[PDB]
Each structure stands twice: as C-alpha cells, then as structure tokens.
Homo-oligomer: A and B are copies of this chain.
Amino acid sequence: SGGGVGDVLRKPSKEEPLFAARVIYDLLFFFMVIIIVLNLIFGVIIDTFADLRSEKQKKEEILKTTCFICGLERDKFDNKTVTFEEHIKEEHNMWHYLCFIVLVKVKDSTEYTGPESYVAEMIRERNLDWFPRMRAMSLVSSDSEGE
C-alpha cells in the first residue's frame, strides 16, 4: 500500500516535537524498503530472464552452426565438394552411429569384421576415444606435395 509506514499512522503535523523524527522515519522506511528491496527482487527476476535467454540462444546457435560428433564449425566446409549439409547427413549422421552401437550389441560376439571388433573392445571395457573428435577426412587434401 504505497508509502508504507505512512497513511496508516497518526500523521503528527508540525505541533509535536517528534515531527521531524517521524518524517525521517517515514521517508527512510519508504526509500530503503519499498524502493530498494522490491527493486532488488525484481532486478533478480529480470536478470534471470536475461541469463536464461542467453543460454537458450547459445545452445541454439551451437546446435545449428556446428556439427554434432564431428565438432567442426561449418566454416571449414566452405568449398572442395563436401559441404556441411551433406556432411551432416551422409558422413557424420548420429543415427548411423546408433545403428552401429545396436549392431555391436545385437550381433553374436563373433563372425563380424575387423573394425567392429575394435569398437566392441572400446565399448565393453573402457573409454570412448574411437569417435572423430575434430577430424572428418574431407578437410584433408592429397599427400602428393610431400611425396
């Protein structure tokens, strides 16, 4: 209700000796509590909108302008007949990776090929260093220059 300790007390009006102290009390309560504290809680709420929107925008731009598993940043695939739109679909599609994980799981622990044994060795026992962390075999050129 607005002023705070004002408009509910007795309103001394200039006759009592306690008038100046009452005015100071009223104005000081109104300033610190009603301005600063309520403005602090609402500044906290607005700041949380700012942080949440910043997180969402960062997540969306890093989801759209970079590759998945591959990790590249979509400016490396500017030329040389392998663009990003088919690098996502045909080269580093994660659905093919899930297909490979379930192919390792379903198959009968024998009579499979070479790389599947290596992958199943890295899956069952230990870590995940068989993923293409930052390399894609499309940025690399021919080795004729050193040869």
Contacts and interface: CB of A to CB of B under 8 A. Distances in A.
14 contacts: A2-B2, A35-B38, A35-B41, A35-B42, A36-B45, A46-B46, A46-B47, A47-B49, A50-B50, A50-B53, A51-B53, A78-B133, A78-B134, A79-B134
A45 B39 contact: yes
Interface residues of A, number: 26
Contacts of A49: 43-44, 46-47
Contacts of A46: 43, 46-47, 49
Contacts of A51: 53
Contacts of A7: 1
Interface string A29-42: 00000011011111
